[PDB]
Symmetry: D2
Subunit: 214 residues, 4 copies
């Protein structure tokens, strides 16, 4: 399972422990219609702890400004590329003109896209000039813009994942992280369809997952 | 099939599920064999612990409440236990065997201690039944039950928190009863993550009993 | 601040870091009354919970072990409890009063239930003393003590986790015994953070008893 | 007012503190003599009894470059409130490494030219950003062109146990020089408020190097 996001980003499923029945087993402390009914009962009454026994590992490629928002979710495990020592692809998120639709801009949205590519090209060339002259990466990389792509592994249980979808798969969140949250919701739906449907029905406080088919 | 280890007279540690193995920590450390095992020893030696959070276990444990209270102090984990208010219980209790009192100079034989423990457990359980039969709700009636009453719980924990649990509980300073439970956790962990377990015993394990037993 | 709970229990305030303005400062990332109170209500109303993590409390609680086990399930907090292996204990037990069984149709009078609970507690405690006198270590001998034995612990918790605790424990679905302790926690919280507590009751509180019982 | 300047425009400022060394002593004993209290702090540190130190809490206000704040926010056992890149007003200040930061590195151009080239690209990125804002582009999109050395501000609420884990990892020569400077300031404030815990930490638990080399 791999879903492309933005111009060069992605959300990829690395591993998963369990499925809907893992929450049923934990709720009953015991190793179809009755099991699905139990998932809905747990969700309808705020019994969230059984859902902590379903765990996912994702491999995400996202711009640093999106990764900073994501890393605010503390109840999860992260391993990211080192800005000091890792090899980077040096790819950057260049918003398409349609990203500025709805905004009354003084210049055409095409010019915004061009100006963004222009400054990232200059910052990247300056960075290369510093590396070529012997400056270590940990110092030279500080000139790189916030739209630089990074990669990380994210291990998260279904309860914390559902909190993430409540907050990020919502119109109040930045459009870029909304797109990533839609991909997380899609993989979550594929692996835990009963929990996902129950979540949308009773616990989900956001808006876009009840408007967009994932 | 899955690992199951019996502990004490009626307890057990059972493996329900596991996500990953040693290579899950290697994949997370690289964000992407002698070289893979060498990377595990390197992460362990230099204290790079976060990759080990990408290996997760789910156990089903049956333990006396006094042991479970010690276990539930490990907050970086997920728990689901039988409800003392609403769950049906087996009403089993941990009766220490006479050998548990070896080394202690007791005025009565250790066999009599075992008998006195079974005796008070029987009286508390019969009093409890008398209260339930007369309409007292379980959430009130169960408060007379002794601390050696067996409970059951699911424990979902990553390898990093599990290794912290072994440092603290698989050690002679911890109570003998929880040491037995920690040996079973260490055993299942070794079976699923042999490279991480060996690296842990070699460079990070602070206790004593895992290097003796 | 000390509030008695049950027959021998208590909730006592040991220390507190901050007040309502600590959440205001954190929300604005900056070190008047109506504007500050309006901000507390805005953050509460829209689910901006992280600012409330910058208000912290330390309580000293004396509660029966069955109550303490429910409390220790709240992992986003710090605990230090008396050791069952090595601490000196008071050997006090929670004996429910007859009024605790009101509403239940019992075969025997509620007074007899209270008596039977004191009776088995006394026998378990005497058996425990007989084991200690004969050389059995406390870590083994104490396993015969009932779940209503009182323990003591220090609880350090931030206002966000404390509000989650009130949502779950200051509610009629929770056991009556932990509800009484949650009312005392809500009371001390109200005294120290009156704006946050009022905003909490108005917009984020999911329970029922804090909107029924005067605190 | 404890405030320590870090780098060219950064700082670590103490906002509030709950407790001191005696807060860990009270939690260890579960109870609400100088030599005996200091001896207990050393005993807890020596034998790895860490939970009592969770009852001492600090709140800091930090101004650090985003590349440093990202390293700091990896410490999950803490509370954070940062300026919003989408909606907050910013000072638009950037960390320009001084020539001495490149000492020890054999560079093809003088270290002064590296500093100049960094200021140069920072100025161009900032001017491009202003051109986008002036033309109606929202800040959440326009700001993505700003470099990683842009200063941000955040409130950090952390207990002494997590703070000591942070010092173990960041107040060490293996960590990036920039975050070590911030960790030294955190250690100084910690030492001022909890001198017994800090000394005990340095004697028995600290695994880094620089806090045993720098006073
Ligand atoms: C639209 C939007 C705007 C935002 N704007 C800002 C902003 O301007 N500035 C900013 O700093 N942040 C901002 N955030 C980030 C936000 O404050 C949270 O950090 C983020 O959403 C993670 O939420 P969380 O704490 O619930 O998640 P996690 O950290 O994963 O926590 C999950 C749950 O665990 C519990 N929890 C975890 N740790 C603690 C703790 N230490 N204390 C108490 N309970 C805890 C809580 O119940 C929490 O819901 C914004 C988020 C969104 C969605
Ligand atoms: C021999 C022995 C005797 C003990 N005696 C007592 C006793 O008398 N009284 C008593 O109350 N307890 C006692 N304990 C329990 C002990 O204090 C811990 O509560 C328990 O071992 C869990 O340890 P932990 O905090 O490392 O684990 P977890 O709670 O799982 O935490 C794991 C790790 O996460 C971090 N952590 C998690 N939450 C926080 C937080 N809020 N702040 C900072 N860091 C955090 C720390 O790095 C910690 O090591 C005893 C334990 C042992 C082994
Ligand atoms: C009426 C009632 C009945 C209950 N019955 C039972 C029962 O029968 N059996 C039983 O075992 N328990 C039972 N519980 C306990 C319950 O499951 C919780 O353990 C307890 O209420 C603590 O809530 P919490 O997990 O939100 O609190 P905390 O553990 O303090 O967590 C606070 C917040 O942090 C987050 N969180 C913390 N750790 C994690 C994690 N590892 N993964 C994801 N998110 C995390 C969540 O957002 C959570 O809301 C009962 C509770 C109530 C109120
Ligand atoms: C020199 C150096 C280089 C680094 N390089 C990289 C890098 O290349 N890439 C990268 O991604 N990170 C890197 N890191 C960051 C590192 O992996 C940690 O994220 C960071 O040090 C935070 O430490 P912590 O996890 O112990 O802290 P916290 O998250 O504050 O945790 C405190 C303690 O709580 C416990 N804990 C908290 N949450 C959990 C959990 N979910 N499961 C288990 N235990 C838990 C642990 O005992 C931990 O020590 C680097 C750090 C250093 C110092």
């Amino acid at each position: 399972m791999k879903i492309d996001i933005l111009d060069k980003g992605f959300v990829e499923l690395v591993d998963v422990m369990g499925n809907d029945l893992s929450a049923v087993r934990a709720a009953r402390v015991s190793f179809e219609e009755r099991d699905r009914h139990l998932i809905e009962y747990l969700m309808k009454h705020g019994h969230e702890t059984p859902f902590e026994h379903i765990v996912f590992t994702f491999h995400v490629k996202a711009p640093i400004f999106v990764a900073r928002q994501w890393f605010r979710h503390r109840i999860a495990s992260y391993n990211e590329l080192s800005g000091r020592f890792s090899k980077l692809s040096y790819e950057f998120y260049i918003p398409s003109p349609e990203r500025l639709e709805g905004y009354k801009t003084t210049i055409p949205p095409e010019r915004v896209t061009e100006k963004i590519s222009e400054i990232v090209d200059k910052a990247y060339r300056t960075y290369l000039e510093l590396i070529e002259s012997g400056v270590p990466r940990e110092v030279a990389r500080i000139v790189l813009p916030l739209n630089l792509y990074t990669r990380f592994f994210w291990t998260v249980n279904a309860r914390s994942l559902m909190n993430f979808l409540n907050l990020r798969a919502d119109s109040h969140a930045q459009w870029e992280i909304q797109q990533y949250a839609l991909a997380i919701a899609r993989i979550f739906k594929e692996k835990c369809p009963w929990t996902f449907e129950a979540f949308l029905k009773y616990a989900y406080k956001g808006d876009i997952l009840k408007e967009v088919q994932v």
